Design a protein around this motif. Structure first.
Motif: not given
Ligand code: NI
Ligand code: NI
Lengths: 462, 20
Positions: A342-369
């Protein structure tokens, strides 16, 4: 990435291409046997299905440019990756044209089955016209290279492929931006050895998954990415890339010891000209699509990004303890501690990168195997030998896929390919697939590979 | 890197760059 200008080919003198805009995709014999809601992408500006201006849509991806030169965070990041790469002992010396064109083990030959660049396609000259595997002869390439020179325009067209209905109303088709064969060769001569070492070493030192065989590479992943997994998606990675990222790439190529002539090829990729139909246009920033090493360079850049993003967002990040692999914009990484995307995405956006939850996931929950996804695929431990990991392509993609075909003669090869992907999901679902295939007279005439035999073969790979 | 480290202090949870 950002378009700087547009001019009629009339005004530039660039050769146009007279395409037809007709999709080669036909509904297949299983068209209404399986379920799906995708169809051929919008190929031209008047497709009856457009709820928007096409050209508009195609180019919205070029969201602009935020950094043109690296801050400290991006420099510290470029170095660590470069450093990490050092242990590979990469061959920095130029490749023979013969190898560049005809391949090696760990560097596959240029595909004679796709378009040669500008101006070749416009002039009706073909790859096969210049290249011959039987002779491995380079005198005709040299002749064409000398003729048309280098730094040619990326010839550009719409990808003939299936899209969701929403991507079809919204005109969200994709582009193929092919470099001229001349630059493809010239580029491969400059980086062909680096390509070899990357292809031969998919994994955690290269940080690359390019040219990997998921059948087997998947089992290696859990081992290579220990601790706390993290992952996200990019919205138009390629087009969103700012020039700073090409600067950062040269930084790395230089630290690992590439010459200044090799390093000058990166600009001709940062800063490009395209010819779509008959307008030519300059792009600055972002990475093209049908360009050589496009995958490798993207992955390399992604290897820098994830770094910059980290040391910048957080404090006390140790980069030696980051494990990643990347395939273009696709990433999987781990780290000893959980990492807040959620944070990486904020800081990533400052760089012009749109980052979103993995697997179209509703939010940046824990990714597990269990939910994790890479190259579209999930991770399913074999029931009997849990240390063997199945690459799992979703059946839904396989369903979508079976309903169409670019060639009706090719239904046997088409289906067994889909089966080679499907069985990894498990016997119960593989049988459910085959049974609905065999639910139709054509499907019963078909030779369909058997589950336990497929598995056996796979075991033999380890 | 990626594989196992050693010297010479313990690693703690990442701490979010605040303001700065
Ligand atoms: Ni239909
Ligand atoms: Ni220009």
């Amino acid at each position: 990435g950002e378009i700087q200008w547009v001019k009629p080919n009339k005004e530039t003198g660039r050769l146009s291409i007279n395409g037809p805009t007709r999709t080669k995709l036909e509904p297949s014999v299983f068209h209404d046997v399986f379920e799906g809601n995708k169809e051929p992408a919008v190929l031209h500006s008047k497709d009856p299905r457009l709820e928007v201006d096409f050209e508009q849509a195609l180019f919205s991806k070029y969201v602009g440019n935020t950094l043109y030169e690296p801050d400290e965070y991006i420099k510290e990041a470029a170095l660590h990756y470069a450093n990490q790469l050092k242990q590979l002992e990469i061959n920095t010396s130029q490749m023979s044209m013969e190898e560049a064109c005809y391949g090696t083990e760990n560097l596959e030959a240029i595909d004679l089955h796709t378009s040669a660049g500008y101006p070749y396609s416009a002039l009706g000259i073909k790859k096969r016209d210049i290249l011959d595997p039987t002779t491995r002869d380079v005198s005709k390439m040299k002749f064409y290279m000398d003729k048309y020179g280098l730094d040619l325009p990326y010839s550009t067209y719409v990808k003939d492929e299936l899209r969701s209905i929403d991507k079809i109303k919204k005109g969200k088709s994709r582009l193929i931006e092919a470099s001229s064969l001349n630059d493809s060769v010239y580029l491969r001569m400059a980086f062909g050895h680096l390509y070899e070492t990357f292809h031969a070493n998919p994994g955690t030192i290269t940080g690359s998954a390019v040219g990997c065989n998921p059948d087997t590479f998947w089992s290696k992943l859990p081992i290579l990415l220990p601790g706390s997994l993290f992952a996200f998606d990019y919205s138009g990675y390629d087009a969103s890339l700012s020039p700073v990222w090409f600067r950062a790439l040269e930084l790395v190529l230089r630290e690992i010891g590439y010459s200044e002539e090799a390093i000058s090829l990166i600009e001709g990729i940062n800063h490009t000209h395209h010819v779509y139909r008959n307008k030519t246009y300059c792009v600055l920033g972002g990475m093209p699509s049908g360009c050589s090493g496009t995958s490798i360079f993207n992955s390399m850049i992604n290897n820098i990004i994830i770094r910059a993003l980290l040391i910048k967002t957080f404090k006390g990040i140790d980069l030696d303890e980051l494990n990643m692999v990347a395939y273009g914009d696709d990433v999987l990484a781990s780290y000893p501690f959980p990492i807040d995307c959620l944070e990486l995405a904020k800081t990533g956006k400052e760089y012009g990168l749109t980052m979103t939850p993995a697997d179209k996931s509703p939010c940046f929950n824990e990714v597990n195997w269990d939910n994790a996804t890479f190259l579209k695929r999930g991770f399913l431990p074999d029931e009997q030998f849990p240390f063997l990991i199945h690459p799992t392509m979703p059946m839904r993609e396989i369903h979508e896929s079976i309903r169409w075909t670019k060639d009706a003669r090719n239904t046997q090869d088409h289906v067994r390919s889909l089966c080679l992907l499907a069985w990894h999901n498990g016997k119960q679902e593989y049988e459910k697939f085959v049974s609905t295939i065999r639910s139709v007279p054509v499907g019963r005439a078909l030779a369909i590979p058997n589950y336990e035999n497929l598995r056996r073969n796979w075991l033999e790979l380890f | 890197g990626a594989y196992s480290g050693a010297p010479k202090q313990v690693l703690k949870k990442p701490a979010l760059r605040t303001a700065t």
